[PDB]
């Protein structure tokens, strides 16, 4: 399975989040996402081409897949429900 | 691609496969008039999820800051992240 | 609706007209799986136009502001706007 | 516009937008909004989705007009005018 690299941005995202969502998010990131990253998420479009987004619970995980080094870079973690 | 409905009907499987394999969109034209689009499910799902990201407040700038982190190799320890939010 | 390929194939002309006039999406299935979707051209272009709006730097926050103006009836004079621009 | 003719209603927000634009771009938008747009608000724009359902957007030149077609008030409510890029 894939190596995981967690950006400082994403770590701060976890810190900002309600503790329960964060713990659920982390579990997700270290388990299922790391085995099937091309499947669990969906490629992003327009300015976000090259990135994937996965969604579950009340969290959303944006990442890049570095095949050439077998690695998942966690870019941003977001609260699903949030909206203007 | 823009294709009349009868040709789509003939090789629809080939058109669905093509649309599935690339992410090309077939604009279907009935009686010389655009009617519907054949799009890949994953392609449609891809633009609907991008909508979800762009709607999330602050997501766009947070993503740029995270890309910048990758560019600098500014990553945190996985062992610490597990610690702080597991048992 | 969710319709197998060959059935879509047999009534493609009919499904395209229905998609055209209701904007119902038809998930064409191959091997019990979602492969492609028939979607209205208007339906797709409105997804895409929403994306263009949402990626505009200040757009979501201003729209929230203008909707609050609507709720307050905080509208400006048309004759003043027209005079001030358009020479 | 006939029988129950619609009229434009420009939010404070959109006037501020118009003021923030180069005078040239602002002028054409105003021309577009009161003529073409007021006459075919359903045709010259596309309805928006997700958080923005209820709204439309029309594209022209360097500008995007985000509006609501308020049939109970017979109004085209101009909510935000933004620059295209
Ligand atoms: Cl007021």
Residue numbers in the entry:
A (entry chain B): 6 to 89
B (entry chain D), C (entry chain C): 2 to 88
D (entry chain A): 2 to 86
Lines from the paper:
The RelE3(YoeB) toxin, which is mildly toxic when compared with HigB1, RelE1, or RelE2 was also shown to act as an RNase. Both RelE1 and RelE2 are acutely toxic, very similar in sequence (∼54% identity) and were proposed to have redundant functions in M. tuberculosis.
Furthermore, we solved the crystal structure of the RelE1–RelB1 complex at 2.20 Å resolution and showed that it forms a heterotetrameric complex in which the RelB1 antitoxin likely displaces the C-terminal α-helix of the partner RelE1 toxin, and identified key residues of the catalytic region that are essential for its activity. The asymmetric unit contained a heterotetrameric RelB12RelE12 protein complex. RelB12RelE12 forms a triangular (or inverted V-shaped) complex with the RelE1 toxin molecules positioned away from each other. Each RelE1 protomer, RelE1 and RelE1′, forms the expected RNase T1-like fold, and the C-terminal region of neither toxin was resolved in the structure. The RelB1 antitoxins dimerize through respective domains comprised of an N-terminal three-stranded β-sheet and the α1 helix, which then extends and wraps around cognate RelE1 toxins using helices α2, α3, and α4. Interface analysis using PISA identified salt bridges between RelE1 R50 and RelB1 D44, and RelE1 R65 and RelB1 E50, alongside RelE1 hydrophobic patches corresponding to hydrophobic faces of RelB1 α2, α3 and α4 helices, generating complementary interacting surfaces. The N-terminal dimerization domain and α2 helix of RelB1 are highly conserved, whilst α3 and α4 amino acids are not conserved. While R50A, S58A, R61A had no, or little impact, the R60A, R65A, R85A, and Y89A substitutions significantly affected RelE1 toxicity, thus highlighting R60, R65, R85, and Y89 as key catalytic residues of RelE1.
